[model samples]
Target chain A: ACGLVASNLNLKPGECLRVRGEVAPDAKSFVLNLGKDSNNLCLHFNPRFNAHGDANTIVCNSKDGGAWGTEQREAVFPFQPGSVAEVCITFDQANLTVKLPDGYEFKFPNRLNLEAINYMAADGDFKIKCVAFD
Target chain B: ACGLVASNLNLKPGECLRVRGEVAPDAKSFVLNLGKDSNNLCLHFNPRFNAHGDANTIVCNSKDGGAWGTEQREAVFPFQPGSVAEVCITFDQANLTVKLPDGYEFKFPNRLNLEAINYMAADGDFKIKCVAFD
Candidate 1:
């Protein structure tokens, strides 16, 4: 349940992207990247839990024109290793709306600040149970 | 698409509580309550976005013994100030599984940690399009 990230993920307006998975108890972090490609990250979600020398923090960002934007951080982290977590992401004109595992929410500007996204990639110290668009 | 909160909704182990409604967009937050009655709360779901002087957060808690529990907050606030969202909640013996508007999932301790509950109530900043048990 740990390998394989979503690719060619088809998403549209008024639709929610659903992902369910469990974090390995000794997990350092897990990342969910959405965009046209890995190089073009529209929404980069990295949950680092005492991994890479960083304390618990969620880093969100986007990449464009082969360059990444400023990193956004959320100090409130609820993900624990050895637990199941699910997140849903969708959008409107101004930004992307993300619902975290604990119903926590985060909004990220579209990569180019638009309303559509075409791809997704997820990987980290975790095992995935299911991922779907419903 | 508005008026009247859902009352006396009985639920079983596998049934899901589905709520469909329009967010005022200009709205601040919405609350969905579940339990025996207004006086009891098995789960209190609230999404606050710049409302009541809140930056943004999904605060979840429960009521028992005629008092409230801890305020669980999730930083990734995804409910659009204006839009429609459908949230689903179902439970088993160990906990409650909440399916957010965007397919985001959350697990609550089941309040009293029982196997079944027979009461539910919901009210808040948004409108009630339709709510049910399925």
Candidate 2:
């Protein structure tokens, strides 16, 4: 049976971090892994739209599989030609908050224990500038 | 074993259509099916973003699984606040051409037979104004 594993990022019970990046043209989507050893918790944003004229999209889903949490939502922003949009995800012990350039915020609750969280990953075609924990 | 089925959309050997729409805030993504019976061929675009201030994204993938065809890509457009950017996808017998608002185009070849193609679906949260066949 698949059991839960604690993280190596040493994330406390109630902590937060900022994950940001620019999606690539060929990038189908991206994944965000939390905690160390690629275990703990993971978020996936697939089908990152190509930088062209039109609205780009970022989708978030849990690694366990199933529909993305309620906090998971879409962000429509004005992407400068050839430039990447800035995305931020904030997490607390029981919830995750996402902020887009438009000032809109999406919040989702963390059903799992936060203490099991730590590492982070951005899968697919995209450049993550930084994932800072404060 | 599940074998491939033909479509009922009355698609010819080499034909194409334009599929476009705006992603909803709650929408994680969408799926597009071609031909009748939801069989022939299908495409999916998940994580349609909520109209905010950042760039919006649309990811495309085949129904059969595996990475999105080469034509699948991200489109970074200037999404006007509260406005839905127009997106389009063109399909031919052996290829699919995706044109973004920025004038960038992504193309992929169709490895399946086009004669059996028909029907279309837009899964997830989003509004599809039209799916025109020419």
Candidate 3:
């Protein structure tokens, strides 16, 4: 079964967040969000193993004032079912960059235009082992 | 200034803990402990850049009932000062295996012989980025 792992974090610019977790064996998709709240996000990173009409793709987007922006897709997929996956995210006010497990970088615009975000969440078919920011 | 990052965690035999962090620029050493508490740790994994007459080495030991056991040393040090280091640990009743950042495996005996542990901590010249267990 899928569950939620959320944290109230004071994530700021010039900091990098490293996340490590296990992908569910029957996983379809998982999303990790960094933002001020659920309704206002700076980066919405979703990895689809086989979901949303996509296979082995990562979709990046944002939500501002309860509305989602245009999605950006990246084809570098380094995740496998029932295996441990790790990713690192670094962001400034202008852009958010995600470093995939295979050293692929996915850049997305910071649509919410925030300096620091206070919330982070991972929803869907992933069992998070660690969320560390430095 | 080096402070301590400690947590009360119910760690079991089958779990693997992943830790990511930054080593201080002037780091002399750092210690990550897993056990019932500070004084009764089963695995005292210490990495020394240059401290206590040890340079670029990892020391592993245990403490039970406030008495320290014989220390074991592993020379496979993959940590650099002022850089991010990541490690993973998996343990059972007999041995604790630490996977270093450079893919070196260091094994040590579980002297305390406890089936599970309730505490984990990192002390000294390290700024933790994340700690995740699976």
Candidate 4:
């Protein structure tokens, strides 16, 4: 599903990024990717509602030098189809934490070495209501 | 301390707010307050280099009906008198997390009853370079 809509999200140090949207019902899967671009991606947030017709999980990864990193997975999926859900993501110098809809903090590595990443792209199973970072 | 500068900031849930600025060389204290208006405040961030006789502390509070809430103080002071620093504050429904200059998360209560806060004011010894809420 490469019909991706991207926007400029200024994710600076000492700042947080909040992406609010809804998952589409009958949604096989979708992805929210944050990076330098499609080429140099830092964070690829993929919420697979039905992965391989077997599981539901949030897979996060990074793309550097045009190569994708190992997929980091979270088993607890809180997104509900046809209802609004909020994903709050913030990073320090050490780690990036994702606050789920049910208020769970899922942490991942912050390997993107930039002052701020300006590009964010989303596609597939969800409709993004809004995106903001400060 | 009341000729405070403020701009349009529409805060929403899961969003993070960042304020970056510098302190004057002779800085003794300053405050950054978020609220609906000057009369009612939500987060009152006050950092005193020389609080009272001699105490460097960060104190936070709120105002409702023009009465101050219980003062919240953090003893670890990371701000320098003549340097620049970035402060990041993010909130969910439960609590507000403040990321300080030296990577410390300061916790404070959100007493104001609002989906989002619209106004912010700052005064005293520091100069606010920019404020962004997303």
lDDT by residue (tens digit), candidate 4, B23-74: 7788788778777777787788888888666468888888987899998889
Q: What DockQ, between 0 and 1, does each candidate earn?
A: 0.02, 0.01, 0.19, 0.02
**Kept native contacts, fraction for each prediction:** 0.00, 0.00, 0.40, 0.00
lDDT of 4 at A88: 79
Better of 1 and 4 by TM-score: 4
Looking only at chain B, model 3 earns a TM-score of 0.92
lDDT score at residue A93, model 1, on the 0-100 scale? 66
Winner by TM-score: 3
Candidate 3 CAPRI grade: incorrect
Question: TM-score of each model's B chain?
Answer: 0.83, 0.57, 0.92, 0.89
Poorest 10 consecutive residues by lDDT, candidate 2 chain B: B1-10
Between candidates 3 and 4, the DockQ winner: 3
Quote the positional error of residue B4 for candidate 4 in Å: 5.2
Best candidate, DockQ-wise?
Answer: 3
> Which ranking of candidates, highest TM-score first?
3, 4, 1, 2
Q: What lDDT does the true structure give each of the candidates?
A: 0.69, 0.46, 0.78, 0.71
Between candidates 1 and 3, the one scoring higher on TM-score is 3
lDDT accuracy of residue A8 in candidate 2: 31
The C-alpha stretches of model 2 lying farther than 4 A from their native spots are A1-7, A35-42, A50-55, A65-72, A75-82, B1-134
Q: Where does candidate 1 stray beyond 4 Å? A: B1-134
